[PDB]
Structures are given as C-alpha cells and as structure tokens.
C-alpha cells in the first residue's frame, strides 16, 4: 500500500489526497472519478427537476436551475419561453447520467487497479510537474478542448435550432443566429468596459449576436493558444516569475476559478439575456422597476398625471431624472435605472421613459409582466418562504437567481481562500521551509535588529 499512511507519505489522513501529488495514475483516477461525480449530478439533478416539473408553472416557481440552462439553449421551449416539449430535458439528463457511469468506471479503474504511476507505462501520458514542456502541452490539449466547446455553442446557435432570445421582436422566442458579431472592437470592447453602474463589463452583454460572436472568438483563441502551448516551452521571464510545481498550478487554477465564480455571481444577478427572466425569474433591478411600472399604471388608470405628480420629497412620485437627465422611475428604484428589459423598452425614447408612450402605448401584456415580475422579486427566506423577511408563510418561493448567486459567491470565496492557502504553501515548499523554521538556521537570527 504505497504512500497510504502518514509515516511513509508525510501527510495525515485529513490531507490524504496530498499523497497523490506524484502518483500520476492514481491522480488521474481521482480526477476522472470526480468528473464522473459532476456529470452524475448534472444528469440526476436534471431528471429530478423534470419529474418535479409542471409545464404550465413558471420554471422559477419550481426551484429549477438546470432546465432553465437547457431552455436558454433553445431546447424544449417556444414563444415567450413556454414549454412545448420536455423530451430534450429528459435526453440531457439521461445522457449525462449514462456518461457518468463511464467516467466513474475509468476513474475507479485508474484509482485502485491501474498503474499507480504512468511515466514507466507511457511517456505520452506520464508527466513531471517540473517538466514545463509537458505541462504546457497538456494545457494545450485542454485549451483545444475548451475552444471546441465554445464552438459547440456557436454551432447550436447557428446551425442546430438557435438560442432562446428574450429580445426577439414580437416577443421572446427561439431564434437562429445568422449574423454573429465578428468585429473585435465590439467583442473586446466589452472587456474594456468599467464594472461599475451603467457599464457592467462583460455582464452587460445584451444581444445574442454578441454572445455567439464572442464564443467564435474565444474558440479560435483557445484552439490557437492550445496549439501554441503544445509547440512551445515557457519563455525565460515566465520561468523566473512562476513557481513550477503541482500545488502551485493548483493554486493558479484556484485563483482563476474564484474569479470566475464571482463573475458568474454577478452574471446571474444582473444579466437577463443569457439568463432569460422567463426561465430564471426577474432580476432584483427588474422586479423593483416592475413595481414602479405597476403602480404608475394603476394610478394613471385612476386619472393621475404621472409626469407631473410630485412625491413627498419633491422628486417625482412616479418619474424623475437620472443624474445625467434621462427620464426614469421614481422612488427607491431610482438606483436601478440602468435596467433594460423587453417589457420596459417599448416605453423608452431617446431621453428615457417617454411620457407620451407611457400615457398611450402601455399594453396589457406589459401590465401583466410588470405585475408578475414585481410579485416574483428575488427575495425569500432560507426555508423558502417568499418575500421580505416580515412576510407571513404562504408562498413557497426563492428565486433561482438568488440560489445561483449565493451558492457561487460562497464557492468563489472559499476558492479564493484555497488559492491563498495553496499559493503560500507552494512558495514555502519550493523554497523549502513549508514544514517550519530550521532551529540551527533561523533566518531572522542572521538579520540585523530593526532597532
């Protein structure tokens, strides 16, 4: 039983997977088996959601987070996001579940049956962490894989049904993307936008052309980069800047994933394009705005002139100006005026909310949508009582946007912590004092006193 106790390995049971660091075959096993865990949960969770799914209820009233993901890709839904066929959901679930058996098979094999090290078995599959060449090559393979995935999204969007477009003229619908955005000014333009209000960095992407073109770009970039990393070895400055070891690489990727986690938190909280509100429920901004719209409509039906109604503070009760002058909804929702949504935009003119349009053009479907979104705001308790904390039990509801945002903030945080942990440790180990200070060679003792 090689390296399977503290004595031989140096690592206690609670740090047991650290015993796998230079056992490439067993480590392969752990990784493939974990991949199987992920795929398993995708499929199983999908089937669970689908069994618990009433088609004539909004997805977001049913605690669904995967079916919304499938629906956004254009599978299973029609105009307005209405479920017209559940079978594709069933397929996604079943095929992931079946695939997880394969992955778990391979993982269990490599983990407790196959060659514990791969280097003496195969020079192609074996590796040394310090071998910068081989490392960048494996990196390369996987970059090619990622690029291929992004291109799979492109292909779905352009050649296999299209995507669900909440912005589709005449109402949200599945639409084929025929003219993806290729212009780099736009695509990387997103990357150079401020993350602050009214800008929102890449989180602000608000049309499917930009999304598809974005993935075209990312796919080519990843494939080219992957080939590049197969055919080269790290340059000198890179060599002198980095720590070259398993734990170090793990730390780098942990930092990356933490970043990605935070980014996704913001994505699901603000964006309503790749997270359609039809499937995920309204964003917080969306719902607040929707309340303002709702009572503007009610009060205006009662005979109120909403453009001239002065609120208690002196600001418009219904309508006011943004700091740069655009007409916007009044009340606290003044903070959310950067919100844009398919149900509100028909009321918007060059200077913002248009009073004539507001007086004459508001349609019943808009009232409906505003009411729905206002009454499904992403607020709710941990035991899933919907509404503000003071609400009485009755409505079983917490928005999928809340579940997704909170989960992924928690995970991004702990992954940042993990990055600090393993980065610091990788530095200490590479320099050689990760187990403590050498009593006979205590560095501080050879330093001049501070005073």
């Amino acid at each position: 039983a090689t390296n399977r106790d503290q004595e031989s390995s140096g690592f206690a049971w609670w740090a047991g997977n650290a015993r796998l660091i230079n056992l490439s075959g067993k480590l392969l096993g752990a990784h493939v088996a974990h991949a199987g865990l992920i795929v398993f949960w995708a499929g199983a969770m999908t089937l669970f959601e689908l069994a618990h799914f009433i088609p004539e209820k909004p997805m977001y009233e049913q605690g669904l987070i995967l079916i919304p993901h499938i629906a956004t890709l254009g599978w299973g839904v029609g105009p307005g996001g209405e479920v017209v066929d559940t079978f594709p959901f069933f397929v996604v679930g079943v095929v992931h579940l079946i695939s997880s058996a394969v992955l778990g098979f391979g993982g269990v094999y490599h983990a407790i049956r196959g060659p514990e090290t791969l280097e003496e078995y195969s020079s192609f599959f074996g590796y040394d962490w310090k071998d910068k060449n081989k490392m960048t090559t494996i990196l390369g393979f996987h970059l090619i894989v990622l690029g291929i995935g992004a291109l799979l999204l492109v292909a779905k969007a352009m050649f296999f049904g299209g995507l669900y477009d909440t912005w589709a003229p005449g109402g949200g619908d599945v639409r084929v993307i025929t003219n993806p955005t290729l212009d780099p000014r736009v695509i990387f333009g997103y990357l150079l936008k401020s993350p602050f209000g009214g800008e929102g960095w890449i989180v602000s992407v608000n049309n499917l052309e930009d999304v598809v073109g974005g993935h075209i770009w990312i796919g080519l970039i990843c494939i080219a980069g992957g080939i590049w990393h197969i055919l080269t070895t790290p340059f000198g400055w890179a060599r002198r800047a980095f720590i070259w070891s398993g734990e170090a690489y793990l730390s780098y990727s942990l930092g990356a994933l933490s970043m990605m986690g935070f980014i996704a938190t913001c994505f699901v909280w603000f964006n309503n394009t790749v997270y359609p509100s039809e499937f995920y429920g309204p964003t917080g901004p969306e719902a607040s705005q929707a309340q303002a719209m709702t009572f503007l409509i009610r009060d205006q039906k009662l005979g109120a002139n909403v453009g001239s109604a002065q609120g208690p503070t002196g600001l418009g009760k219904y309508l006011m100006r943004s700091p740069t002058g655009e007409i916007i909804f009044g009340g606290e929702t003044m903070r959310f005026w950067d919100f844009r949504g398919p149900w509100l935009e028909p009321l918007r003119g060059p200077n913002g909310l248009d009073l004539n349009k507001i007086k004459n053009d508001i349609q019943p479907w808009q009232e409906r949508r505003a009411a729905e979104y206002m009454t499904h705001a992403p607020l709710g308790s941990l035991n899933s009582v919907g509404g503000v904390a003071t609400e009485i039990n009755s409505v079983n509801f917490v928005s999928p946007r809340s579940w997704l945002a909170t989960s992924h903030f928690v995970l991004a945080f702990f992954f940042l912590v993990g990055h600090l942990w393993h980065a610091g440790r990788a530095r200490a180990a590479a320099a050689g004092f990760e187990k403590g200070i050498d009593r006979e060679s205590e560095p501080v003792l050879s330093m001049p006193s501070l005073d």
């Binding site: 004539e56 209820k57 209405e82 709702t294 009610r298 019943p364 479907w365 009232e367 409906r368 009411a371 206002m374 009454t375 499904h376 919907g386 509404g387 003071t390 609400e391 009485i392 009755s394 409505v395 079983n396 509801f397």
Partner: protein, 137 residues
C-alpha cells in the same frame, strides 16, 4: 377550537343558500389558492393594488356581489373591476385568460369552488388578519 362544519358552511349564492365544505375541500382550497393566487393575494390582501382586499365585507360591497360561492367562481371565470363596469381578464388570471395565465389551464370547476370556499372560510378563522396586511401579522 376546531375547524367545524359550522365554520365550513358558507354562502352559496345571494339568495340565502349555504353550502358546507368538507375538510378535504378546505385543504384543496388552501393548496389551490397558494398555487394560483397567493403570489398576489397572500393573507387576503392584493399586492399589485392594496386598495382592494379579499375581506368578505369588501366582496359583499362589490358588483356583482362576490361574498358567496357563485360570485367567486364567476370572478375566477370573468373577473371585473369593483363596480362591475370593466372585464379585466386580460390583466387578471381567469379561465377565460388561461392562454396568457397558464396556471389557470388545469383548474377545474371543482378547483374554482375549493378556492372560493377558501377565500370565504379563511376570514372566519383569522378574523382581521385576513385582508389586514402587516399591521395584523
């Protein structure tokens, strides 16, 4: 205190006829009300227009009267403004607008009766809490 047959006896129509709901009907009513109505009417108020509540006195002063089973069933089919003057199916869930309010599609006549009964019985249990809003929490 118990949920008695007397508590569960509510006006069927405007002409003094009553109907006694079973306990199964009461539970069905609460479930269906939560299913199709509570998002706006939790606790007997109305979130998208708090001026109108689901208190029995309020429903009685509505036009046509809505403080009985037939009134509430009709409302769930062809809802009107408080004065009866406008049909508001286009902005309020009903069987008539099941196409644009899809949770209404699987509601049967039986279901409408259960919901109606819930709306009428619950104030008999909760008193001023029903339609009271946060003051009465």
């Amino acid at each position: 205190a118990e949920l008695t047959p007397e508590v569960l006896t509510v006006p069927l129509n405007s002409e003094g006829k009553t109907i006694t709901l079973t306990e199964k009907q009461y539970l069905e009513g609460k479930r269906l009300f939560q299913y199709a109505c509570a998002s706006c009417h939790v606790g007997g108020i109305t979130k998208t227009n708090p001026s109108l509540d689901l208190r029995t006195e309020t429903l009685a002063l509505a036009t046509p009267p809505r403080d009985n089973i037939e009134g509430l069933v009709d409302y769930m089919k062809n809802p009107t403004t408080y004065d009866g003057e406008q049909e508001i199916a286009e902005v309020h869930p009903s069987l008539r607008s099941a196409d644009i309010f899809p949770k209404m599609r699987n509601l049967t006549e039986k279901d409408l009766v259960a919901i109606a009964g819930h709306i009428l019985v619950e104030p008999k249990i909760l008193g001023d809490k029903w339609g009271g809003g946060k003051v009465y929490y």
